[PDB]
């Protein structure tokens, strides 16, 4: 079953981002052939974390998302026994060396309020920072500390809205929005 969402994701995202998404889905027992909306979601999430790490300075962020489970953990432990930060209960996305805290990036289709409420209740470990983006343009972070500057986050929102426009122009946005 070859879907339109799959071919659009392959045409829309970076080949390496696509490959990393495929590796993650297959590692967690999911099929990008049929789990197409999830495939698109993890592609957007990967690109957003990569642009996020692109912001800031040179040695600012350590990248956890993208790495496979065991190695991503290994880096989390290295960072913990180096800086002395509480080991998070679940795998985060990045680590800020300048602010000395883990970062859980979030990309949501609906209201940022609901999404951050859910992920903050599911995290509980209030040490790690939370930064939520949305396709419609909103963003919201812990303590209103949006970590990066305004221009990088504006870039991220522009990319998200471009992806949303492409999905809508291919008659694929409605199935994507009702997926989360
Ligand atoms: C370092 C290597 C791979 C990196 C990949 C990651 C993504 C980066 C790609 C670069 C090229 N840019 C920048 C301009 C456009 C582009 O395409 N960006 C950022 C924007 C979107 C994107 O794609 N980055 C960040 C540092 C440089 C680099 O390449 N990754 C993958 C996950 C972990 C990691 O560090 N590593 C490290 C070891 C394993 C591996 O494969
Ligand atoms: O880290 C993450 N997953 C880590 C494990 C994983 C990675 C890739 N594929 C499957 C598993 C992660 N996942 C999501 C979206 C999500 C939320 C709840 C359950 C499942 C998923 C999805 F779609 F990924 F399967 N939003 C984030 O912001 C985020 O950080
Ligand atoms: Mn993650
Ligand atoms: Mn995340």
DSSP string, 14-53: -HHHHHHHHHHHHHTT--TTT-HHHHHHHHHHHHHHHHHH
Would you call 149 a catalytic residue per the annotation? no
Would you call 119 a catalytic residue per the annotation? yes
Distance 107 CA to ligand 3 centre (A): 11
Backbone angles phi, psi at 81, to 5 degrees: -65, -10
Structure tokens at 137: 């343009």
User: Which ligand is closest to the CA of 92, given by its number?
Assistant: 3
Count of other CB atoms within 10 angstroms of residue 124: 10
Count of other CB atoms within 10 angstroms of residue 110: 13
145 neighbors 105 (Cβ within 8 angstroms): no
> 144: closest CA among 112, 180, 114?
112
Which of 13, 50, 59, 76 is the pocket-test mutation for ligand 1 (most atoms within 8 Å of CB)?
Answer: 50
Cβ-based burial of 9 (10 A; exposed 0-12, middle 13-18, buried ≥19):
buried
Please name the residue ranges forming H helices in 55-171: 69-83, 112-123, 150-169
| Tokens 């409420």 belong to residue | 117
Please, what's the b/e burial string for 62-90 (b: 16 or more CB within 10 A of its CB; e: otherwise)? Answer: bebbbbeeeebeeebeebeeeeebeebee
> 103: closest CA among 53, 164, 161, 59?
53
Distance 109 CA to ligand 4 centre (A): 13
Q: Where are the domains of the chain?
A: 1-180
85 neighbors 77 (Cβ within 8 angstroms): no
- Indicate which atom in ligand 2 lies nearest the CA of residue 25: 9
Q: Closest residue (by CA) to atom 19 of ligand 1?
A: 50
- Residues 98 and 175: their CA atoms lie apart, in Å, by 40
Distance 43 CA to ligand 4 centre (A): 12
DSSP 145: -
- Structure obtained using: X-ray
> 107: closest CA among 62, 41, 8, 30?
41
Backbone angles phi, psi at 95, to 5 degrees: -135, 125
User: Which ligand is closest to the CA of 54, given by its number?
Assistant: 1
Q: Point out the catalytic residue in the list 22, 111, 119, 139.
A: 119
51 neighbors 152 (Cβ within 8 angstroms): yes
- At 71 the three-state DSSP class reads helix
Would you say 118 is a known binding-site residue? no
- Residues 91 and 166: their CA atoms lie apart, in Å, by 31
- Residues 127 and 53: their CA atoms lie apart, in Å, by 19
- Residues 72 and 76: their CA atoms lie apart, in Å, by 6
160 neighbors 45 (Cβ within 8 angstroms): no
Documented resolution in Å: 2.6
- Residues 8 and 5: their CA atoms lie apart, in Å, by 5
- Residues 31 and 39: their CA atoms lie apart, in Å, by 8
**Sequence-ordered list of residues with C-beta below 8 angstroms from that of 82, at least 6 positions apart, any chain:** none
Q: Closest residue (by CA) to atom 31 of ligand 1?
A: 66
Would you say 105 is a known binding-site residue? yes
DSSP 150-165: HHHHHHHHHHHHHHHH
**Sequence-ordered list of residues with C-beta below 8 angstroms from that of 144, at least 6 positions apart, any chain:** none
């Amino acid at each position: 079953r070859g879907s339109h969402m799959e071919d659009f994701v392959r045409q829309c995202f970076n080949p390496m981002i696509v490959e990393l998404a495929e590796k993650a889905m297959k590692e967690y027992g999911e099929d990008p052939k049929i789990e197409t909306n999830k495939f698109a979601a993890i592609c957007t999430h990967l690109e957003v974390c990569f642009m996020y790490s692109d912001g800031g300075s040179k040695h600012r962020f350590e990248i956890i998302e993208g790495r496979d489970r065991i190695m991503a953990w290994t880096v989390v432990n290295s960072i913990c026994n180096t800086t002395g930060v509480e080991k998070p209960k679940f795998l985060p996305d990045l680590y800020d060396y300048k602010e000395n805290r883990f970062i859980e990036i979030g990309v949501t289709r609906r209201e940022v309020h609901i999404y951050y409420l859910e992920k903050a209740n599911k995290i509980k470990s209030e040490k790690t920072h939370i930064h939520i983006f949305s396709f419609t343009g909103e963003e919201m972070a812990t303590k209103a500390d949006y970590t990066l500057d305004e221009e990088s986050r504006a870039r991220i929102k522009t990319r998200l809205f471009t992806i949303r426009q492409e999905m809508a122009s291919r008659s694929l946005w409605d199935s994507f929005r009702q997926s989360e």
